């Protein structure tokens, strides 16, 4: 179920939204210019702050933006609950992590971020 | 196998590169020289320090430099949680098979 919240629905954050939007789009809006400087896209994003200040709201906005971008050209955004991947068997959790990352890198391409 | 890494990429770590050369590269380059002085080659090298200080960088650099230095070498990378299986079996079988293959490649003559 694609969320229906966009960047226009978030207020009071004209800087953090700008930073995450840059880190998500700029490496893929201008691939050749990034390659000219040999600057790779960032691979680690962390969001922290007091409870109920808009972190999940920004996550939903990013998901909606990715959905719109892909529809312009659905399964690229992967949502994982915190302890969801945890399993009682000893080796199942590591195998699940590896399978998730392998599937994510399977669909990864230069023009399509995952 | 990870190519395209060398000591030239790593900067600011001069003594440690020399030590890792002495412990690893030197026994392979010189064996009769070690046997003349009855000096047993060091078998195990551990790398420790603050996170992100370049342990994996030095590892891949030495892995490539061993191949480039000799005038066919095999580098094996295995992680901890990789060799864990939910079944009662294969928890130890995989490790024993890996070491048997390492011994086989050593018998072939290629350093492992």
């Amino acid at each position: 179920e694609v969320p229906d919240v966009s960047y226009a629905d978030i207020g009071g954050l004209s800087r953090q939204i700008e930073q995450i939007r840059d880190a998500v789009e700029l490496p893929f809006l201008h691939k050749e210019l990034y390659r000219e400087y040999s600057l790779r896209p960032p691979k680690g994003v962390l969001l922290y702050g007091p409870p109920g200040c808009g972190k999940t709201l920004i996550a939903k906005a990013v998901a909606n933006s990715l959905a719109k971008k892909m529809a312009e050209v659905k399964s690229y955004f992967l949502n994982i609950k915190g302890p969801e991947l945890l399993n009682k068997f000893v080796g199942e959790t590591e195998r699940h992590i590896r399978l998730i990352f392998q599937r994510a890198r399977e669909k990864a391409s230069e023009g399509t971020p995952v | 196998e990870v190519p395209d890494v060398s000591y030239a990429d790593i900067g600011g770590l001069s003594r440690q590169i020399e030590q890792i050369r002495d412990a690893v590269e030197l026994p392979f380059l010189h064996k009769e020289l070690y046997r003349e002085y009855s000096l047993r080659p060091p078998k195990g090298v551990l790398l420790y320090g603050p996170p992100g200080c370049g342990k994996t960088l030095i590892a891949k650099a030495v892995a490539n430099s061993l191949a480039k230095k000799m005038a066919k070498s095999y580098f094996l990378n295995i992680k901890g949680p990789e060799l864990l299986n939910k079944f009662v079996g294969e928890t130890e079988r995989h490790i024993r098979l890996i070491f048997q293959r390492a011994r086989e490649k050593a018998s072939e003559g290629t350093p492992v």
Binding site: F89 | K86, F87
Partner: peptide
């Protein structure tokens, strides 16, 4: 000086007939 409570991790087991 503290007490702990254990959570078990089940190991796979399968038999035929």
């Amino acid at each position: 000086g503290s007490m702990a409570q254990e959570q078990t991790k089940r190991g796979g087991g399968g038999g035929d007939d």
